[PDB]
Design a protein around this ligand. Structure first.
Ligand SMILES: [Mg+2]
Length: 709
């Protein structure tokens, strides 16, 4: 309903961009359009962030001359302020008295357009939309500025207060593997513990903090918990909460250093959990219906059948379209007309075929294995998986297709075949089949309608389909004598005999209910050679770097540079209408075939043809656009950069992605707007960044007082 900075009282909040006012950053962005990309985007963002914040902190410092002891927290949001020639160290009762003095005697905006410097406290956390400051300086808050912005800016409804204790009644804090319950998940608790309607069973997205009475908060959690009355204890996984990696009172408390303070506080029964709900997972329509996604890894404990179902692999169909196992609930299965075994389709709000492996009574999530849906990038912190009925009124794309493009855009890299889930079993079955296909029994089967004896899951299915109970006892009995043979088990020993039926049926034949062909079900999905090829033709990667954790402008300034993600998206849409998906799919399917069991000639010619399609400008720009969309989205957390290795052997690095976005658009060479260039192995040949910055601050000061005489 309202932001978590206000619903808990930790931070006071002020707005950075006022009521519908013009976006002054979008207007500076055509200085880059005029100059053809020789000003710095992140420098322009800083000037905007420093003006909006200086105007907002000030507008509060006067409206709070009447709430004076609430003003003192906004005082320590600016240390020193240079206005004209005088300097205001706000820590002084003297300078701050003078600061509020000229405040009233002079008007707004135009006066702000006349400060020179500004330095912010470590207390203030700047973002693209707000500025946060802790309510009480008494306590201390043990998480970095990015995690404050990640956790406390999200709107949640009224927060709860759950006890944290190891023994007795409360929430326990287990120390498991990181992401053990899934990436975006961070705990399992019951519906009745956070006040949900009786025996709710799904997943809910929360924004909790872990505090003590004295106002200190040691960890903040961002992500989802799994709600289910079937688990015993409300428990939170410590290693999935944001903790440490910040500076309190001059010292840097690492992730491990804060973990000890909690273990000490948790032992003393003086540790709570202030948690707020952001969205409870319903099953709602979209045709199609959708709900949140949960990892199968978080049902290991409770309802293990869901886990074991989705852990035993995925299978590629006859055309190469992977069919992923999901687990849905009663409401969704009804509205989408699906029962167990049905094939459907699913996507995150890439499109994959889905195999219903189970249906639950009260579930309202879409439980999937995540390693098999990495092609649709499902992160379990509130991503909604849509499911569609069995009608299949569309062409689902083939594994080689999107895994290759995803690789040509550096979002995946070597050609590796998969891991056959039934490798050892099918070997043993093929040795028996050499003898079975010769036997009279094989003729009995082919006379009853079962002519292809190569698929064990089909012969057993096609037999119990059309009666023939006796021709199934003989088949199940022949494979017993054959496998006991082939594995050296004595069919008489009643424990050795119990090992046959434990390997042949339980471990193999019983899985005919989930999979069609055991020869096409994998445990680790392969990497098609066209994808390994496609990733060596475009040498594009997304380089990771953290925003300056000491300067609060760096994050907010970085988040402003995200306000043109839409132009990155239109470029992708406007580009994919050109690429002939028919020719690309056949060009890929040809190379993967000629690679696997092709002659020495075609592995060369199929390579040279696919290479010329991927060195094509329309294709290269579409994949490069797809990369920029991910980089821009990620820059809302870190100072990510683009890196490209060209035919010169050099590698170029970019942090002016709008200029890059312009150069791709009008089909211009993109190397001039770059920020730094490297010499293959050697590095830092041109450092263009310092020049673009001071010229930006110069061309700014020019454009300003020139429009004002
Ligand atoms: Mg997500």
């Amino acid at each position: 309903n309202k932001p978590f900075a206000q619903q808990t009282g930790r931070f006071h909040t002020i707005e950075l961009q006022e009521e519908g006012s013009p976006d002054e950053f979008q207007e500076l962005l055509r200085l880059q359009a005029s100059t053809q990309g020789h000003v710095d985007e992140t420098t322009l963002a800083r000037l905007v962030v420093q003006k909006r914040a200086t105007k907002a902190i000030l507008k509060k410092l006067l409206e709070t001359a009447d709430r004076p002891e609430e003003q003192a927290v906004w005082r320590a949001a600016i240390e020193r302020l240079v206005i004209g020639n005088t300097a205001y160290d706000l820590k002084d009762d003297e300078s701050f008295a003078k600061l509020i003095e000229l405040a009233k005697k002079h008007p707004l905006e135009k006066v702000v357009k006349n400060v020179r410097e500004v330095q912010f406290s470590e207390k203030v956390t700047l973002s693209d939309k707000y500025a946060f400051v802790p309510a009480s300086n008494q306590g201390r808050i043990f998480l970095s500025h990015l995690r404050r912005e990640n956790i406390y800016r999200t709107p949640t409804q009224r927060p709860l207060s759950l006890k944290v204790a190891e023994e007795g009644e409360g929430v326990r804090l287990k120390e498991m593997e990181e992401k053990a319950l899934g990436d975006g998940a961070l705990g399992i608790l019951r519906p009745q513990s956070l006040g949900l309607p009786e025996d709710y069973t799904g997943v809910v997205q929360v924004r909790g903090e872990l505090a003590d009475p004295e106002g200190n908060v040691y960890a903040g959690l961002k992500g989802t918990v799994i709600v289910d009355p079937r688990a015993k204890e409300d428990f939170l996984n410590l290693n999935d909460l944001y903790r440490g990696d910040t500076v309190v009172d001059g010292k840097k408390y690492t992730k491990e250093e804060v973990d000890a303070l909690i273990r000490e506080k948790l032992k003393t029964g003086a540790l709570q959990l202030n948690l707020g709900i952001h969205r409870v997972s319903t099953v709602e329509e979209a045709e199609g219906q959708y709900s949140m996604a949960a990892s199968h890894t978080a049902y290991k404990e409770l309802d293990p059948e869901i886990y074991r179902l989705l852990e035993e692999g995925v299978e590629l169909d006859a055309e190469g379209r992977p069919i992923v196992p999901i687990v849905i609930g009663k409401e969704m299965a009804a509205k989408l007309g699906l029962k167990e075994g049905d094939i459907a389709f699913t996507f995150r709000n890439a499109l994959l075929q889905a195999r219903v492996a189970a249906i639950r009574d009260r579930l309202n999530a879409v439980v999937v294995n995540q390693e098999y849906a990495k092609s649709t990038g499902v992160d379990f912190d509130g991503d909604t998986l849509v499911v569609l009925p069995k009608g299949l009124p569309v062409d689902p794309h083939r594994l080689e297709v999107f895994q290759t493009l995803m690789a040509h855009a550096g979002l995946a890299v070597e050609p590796s075949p998969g891991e056959l889930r039934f490798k050892e079993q099918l070997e043993v079955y093929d040795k028996v089949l050499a003898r079975l296909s010769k036997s009279r029994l094989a003729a009995e089967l082919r006379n009853a309608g079962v002519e292809d004896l190569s698929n064990p899951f089909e012969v057993v299915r096609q037999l119990e389909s059309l009666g023939e109970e006796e021709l199934l006892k003989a088949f199940k009995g022949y494979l017993r004598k054959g496998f006991a043979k082939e594995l050296g088990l004595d069919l008489k020993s009643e424990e050795d005999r119990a090992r046959l039926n434990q390997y042949l049926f339980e471990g193999f034949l019983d899985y005919r209910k989930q999979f069609q062909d055991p020869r096409r079900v994998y445990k680790k999905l392969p990497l098609m050679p066209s994808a390994a090829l496609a990733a060596s033709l475009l040498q594009v990667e997304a380089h990771k770097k953290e925003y300056d954790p000491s300067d609060p402008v760096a994050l907010a300034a970085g988040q402003l540079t995200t306000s043109f993600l839409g132009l990155s998206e239109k470029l992708a849409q406007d580009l994919e209408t050109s690429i002939d998906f028919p020719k690309l799919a056949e060009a890929i399917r040809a190379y993967n075939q000629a690679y696997s069991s092709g002659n020495e000639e075609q592995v060369a010619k199929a390579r040279a043809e696919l290479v010329k399609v991927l060195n094509d400008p329309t294709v290269q720009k579409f994949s490069l656009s797809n990369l920029l969309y991910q980089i821009i989205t990620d820059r809302k957390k870190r100072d990510y950069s683009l890196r490209v290795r060209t035919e010169s052997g050099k590698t170029y690095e970019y942090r002016n992605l709008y200029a890059v976005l312009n150069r791709l658009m009008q089909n211009l060479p993109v190397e001039e707007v770059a920020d730094t260039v490297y010499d293959a192995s050697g590095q830092a040949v041109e450092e263009r960044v310092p020049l673009k910055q001071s010229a930006t601050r110069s061309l700014v000061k020019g454009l300003l007082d020139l429009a004002s005489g």
